[PDB]
Amino acid sequence: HSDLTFCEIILMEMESHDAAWPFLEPVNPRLVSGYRRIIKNPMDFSTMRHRLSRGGYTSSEEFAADALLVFDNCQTFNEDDSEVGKAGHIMRRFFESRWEEFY
Numbered sequence: 671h672s673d674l675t676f677c678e679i680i681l682m683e684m685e686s687h688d689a690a691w692p693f694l695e696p697v698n699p700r701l702v703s704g705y706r707r708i709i710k711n712p713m714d715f716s717t718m719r720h721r722l723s724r725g726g727y728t729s730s731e732e733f734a735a736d737a738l739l740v741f742d743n744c745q746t747f748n749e750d751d752s753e754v755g756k757a758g759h760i761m762r763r764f765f766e767s768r769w770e771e772f773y
């Protein structure tokens with residue numbers, strides 16, 4: 671697929687983005703009070719990398735659903751003016767802008 675090639679490009683650029691630091695690894699619920707209760711379906715860039723490395727994305731749309739889940743969870747748990755919330759808004763707009771550039 672050139673479908674999955676563009677997801678490799680997008681994921682690589684997100685992994686290396688300055689604002690990616692809250693989303694590189696699963697949130698550790700032992701360290702973030704209330705996260706387990708509030709967030710029903712956690713997602714992060716390393717989980718997406720692993721799923722991509724296995725070929726577990728059958729389409730670019732499944733990839734995008736995981737990316738959007740990262741940012742939906744971020745806005746659910748974090749206030750828009752919190753440090754993590756501000757990073758999540760940067761990353762979300764970056765993903766949207768880059769996604770439109772390929773589709």
Ligand SMILES: Cn1nncc1-c1nc2ccc(CN3CCC[C@H]3c3ccncc3)cc2[nH]1
Binds near residue numbers: 695696701747748754
């Ligand atoms: C609240 N939250 N909601 N989405 C993402 C986040 C979030 N990611 C972080 C990434 C690094 C961090 C920074 N630290 C704080 C202690 C350990 C580390 C950490 C690692 C894994 N999980 C939580 C904390 C907070 C972080 N807080």
